[PDB]
Amino acid sequence: AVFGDRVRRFQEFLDTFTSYRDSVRSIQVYNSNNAANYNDDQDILPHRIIISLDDLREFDRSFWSGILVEPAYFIPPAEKALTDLADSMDSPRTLTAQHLNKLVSVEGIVTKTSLVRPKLIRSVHYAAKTGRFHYRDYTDATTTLTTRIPTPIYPTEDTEGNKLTTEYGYSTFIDHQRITVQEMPEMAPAGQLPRSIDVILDDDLVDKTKPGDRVNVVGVFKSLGAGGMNQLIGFKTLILGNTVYPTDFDIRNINKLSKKKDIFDILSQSLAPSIYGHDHIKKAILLMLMGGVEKNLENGSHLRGDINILMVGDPSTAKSQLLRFVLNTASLAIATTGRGSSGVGLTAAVTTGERRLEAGAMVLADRGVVCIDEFDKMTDVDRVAIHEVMEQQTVTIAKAGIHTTLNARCSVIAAANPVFGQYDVNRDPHQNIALPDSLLSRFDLLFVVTDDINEIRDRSISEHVLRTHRVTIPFLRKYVQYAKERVIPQLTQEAINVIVKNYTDLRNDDNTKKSPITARTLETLIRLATAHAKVRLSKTVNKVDAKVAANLLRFALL
Amino acid sequence: SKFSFGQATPRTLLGIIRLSQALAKLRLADMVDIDDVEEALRLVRVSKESLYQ
Amino acid sequence: LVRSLSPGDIVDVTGIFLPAPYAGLLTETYLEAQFVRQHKKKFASTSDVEERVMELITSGDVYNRLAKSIAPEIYGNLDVKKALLLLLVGGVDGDGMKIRGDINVCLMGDPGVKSQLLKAICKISGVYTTGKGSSGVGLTVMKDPVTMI
Amino acid sequence: VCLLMGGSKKILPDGMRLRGDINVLLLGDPGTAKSQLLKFVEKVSPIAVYTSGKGSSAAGLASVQRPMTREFYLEGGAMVLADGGVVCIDEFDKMRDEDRVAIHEAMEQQTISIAKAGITTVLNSRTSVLAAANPIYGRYDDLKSPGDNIDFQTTILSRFDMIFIVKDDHNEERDISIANHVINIHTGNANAQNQQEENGSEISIEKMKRYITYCRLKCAPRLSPQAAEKLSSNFVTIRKQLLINELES
DNA sequence: TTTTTTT
Ligand SMILES: Nc1ncnc2c1ncn2[C@@H]1O[C@H](COP(=O)(O)OP(=O)(O)OP(O)(O)=S)[C@@H](O)[C@H]1O
């Protein structure tokens, strides 16, 4: 009697506010029109509703308190009232012991996604002689949210001797999945390994988190299992009842700001919030974040479009301090420092008896940024795999389990020291690094940074760092992903005449100073005008972008 | 120890015979002739010592 | 339809989706095949062959066109294409030894020649392998599946 | 004294934050007992890691543990215990280049990355390293050119803060004083008078520890604007000093 | 199927 009173009361409240009613109206009308277009020319949305915690507070604090205190009594009847209405219409650190048996909002990182298996709920069985169907359900502790008597064996020959032929199609199924979320590592105490728990999803939310993202989670803390009173520490935990959580004036501001001619320089100086000089270096980070164009050839292979730069310089020129700026400003990047053994270029498959995979560092940074620190200090083992990652954009893993082949087209930035000391221009331009020769042609830009001692520069470094101890960034990444979907460019005739003369300069006179001169350099000549056109959001390719690229080659090398 | 090597193995001759054999296979007629082997010698004298320019 | 599906192909498979009965309520699925439509029709299974071969012969300047036709996506390297055509030919064979109709030409030089032709060889002719991607058991022993191999 | 307190900590709009704790080097001639000094440094700070060399019986340094339930898990190390503390490294030249890179980064950007078979995180390390080296051939390293000490390069020292050279000059009064001062340390507890000194100065070591705990989180130090122009004019003089010793030589 | 060694 209690259940129907809670049902009718919440139904009255849901009937009290019609704001959600027109939402369900749009749900039903849209699914109707979607099935209407699918059944007229040729000859999706679920039923769960976001309920704000707005009106529940202005109606009954008793009922409010009941939801956030004992949710195992009010969410099922409220959904029951909703389904009736649908039919009438047609921190982990302080999480244990207390902050328990309630609805908990959890934040953290998506990691180690498990496997997808479906689960049966409603059985359909046909009897031969009676010529009738039947009905039988089964429940487990994930689905009921209430401690009910479990009813597990698949039925046959129930009452008279009629063959209970089971049927399908009409028999229902629901998928199932469990994932782990550890809290954010910067939030941790003085110095420790972060500790974690897990949350189980349901049917329409299977495979929404891949290992490696930033996710807010809202759900209910559910504890199952016989805690050692079965036959020594039990009562293992998990979380259920879940949701997934990762302007026109603003976009008009974007279109309005982009109507200028020197914002590349303005954004260039913008990306130096604490570093003096290195103007064209910031210009190159803008062009890397632009990402270039992708032109897959006719029945051939794709051509890589992003740009990768490794640095070398005197050990005091923000070599490592330029990296975290690129870390925070871009999107979906992972920083690798020092060693990278067993998991940068591979997945290793160490995981019922089966073989599973965990996406490695190079794979997880797909369509993103790879931050590599101390490239010469990397052991010689993975150096072979770096050529494959950087040139064919694929990773083939052939271990004893299953040989596979996949895609990762990541952007990579590295930072290395000279071989010994500061002799970066003293000995010879060649092999001040003692890197393999193919890696020279593999990387796009190679910066040589000196530590030239002067005085105007000395005073300017002084007041910059000194006032440091005593237009903006969020506008920029929005400007980036907006510039991604409609500013894709196309090459023009004017793009040819400059880079041809430029490649002639690369072979007739550039070889007299340094090396190498590859056709890949000419590909970068196309990519820079492309990225300049993406930053200016142009559609064509202009001669002026190539004029900029000539200075970019001179500043990067000569 | 100049650009040219010291000795010529008989496998060089075995290879050039099989090469001219494949050259005859591209004629699809079993018409092993003077130019058939001459092309086999051309890719040997041109394959090696192409470092003149 | 058994013994009719080679591994590593492109095929249209039709069927019905049924689970299999076995932590207590875990349903492992499978598919029962109903129809096979294979993309990339297998060769060797003469009329349509000579329909283009006789026209290819009577086309004039066939020898330069054949080697010019294998991987024309680069510039120059005409004799290189000649060597690639001759590698594609091969095909040669009492109380002694037979003859191996295989060619083994090595390539030295750098750098813009470098994988552009190397992957193209297996394109025209092919499993592409690297140094570390294959172990000592890779290029040459596992637990036997469902069907000590 | 300056190492046990720790400087400022900047949380700028800049994508990085800077570093606060400092570093101590003691390269020099043997017999100095700089060893006893580094042991007592470990005893004073509340959390700190003292290491004597590159080769242990049992003391490790990003831990990789693969095993029950066939699960990979992260155990620990040494910089992890000393996040926000003191690291003491003895035998700076007797050390290998096997995980030295983690130390070549832990003191400068506070960011340890792991991209192995188990995990793929970027963690924190707020440490401070204290060195105690020995040049080759002892006191003769200063008789040849004044460099000739680290065989790899000088960039590690550029990534340190303070470099001290301990010399050994005979002064008979200083020698007699260091003699009888140490005999008084061993026997007859003459230097050990300390209790009246406790009555007059520095009543305890544990007192100093409780004081540092109180000192670190309470004050929010920052420099003063009238003092900044002094340092700006001084960095010029040091860089000029290096110009004088470098360009003409 | 991956971590500490040494010729
Ligand atoms: N132009 C600059 N403007 C501001 N800060 C700077 C500048 N150049 C250097 N820095 C300083 O860069 C320091 C950190 O330098 P790093 O690049 O980490 O030294 P490092 O030894 O090269 O680092 P690694 O990773 O060990 S190579 C910080 O204290 C910054 O203040």
Ligand SMILES: Nc1ncnc2c1ncn2[C@@H]1O[C@H](COP(=O)(O)OP(=O)(O)OP(O)(O)=S)[C@@H](O)[C@H]1O
């Ligand atoms: N005032 C003192 N000066 C020097 N040594 C002293 C003094 N008082 C006691 N000692 C002892 O004398 C030893 C001298 O060696 P150290 O001073 O440790 O030399 P060292 O330079 O540390 O050599 P290391 O440890 O390999 S760098 C110390 O380890 C103490 O046992």
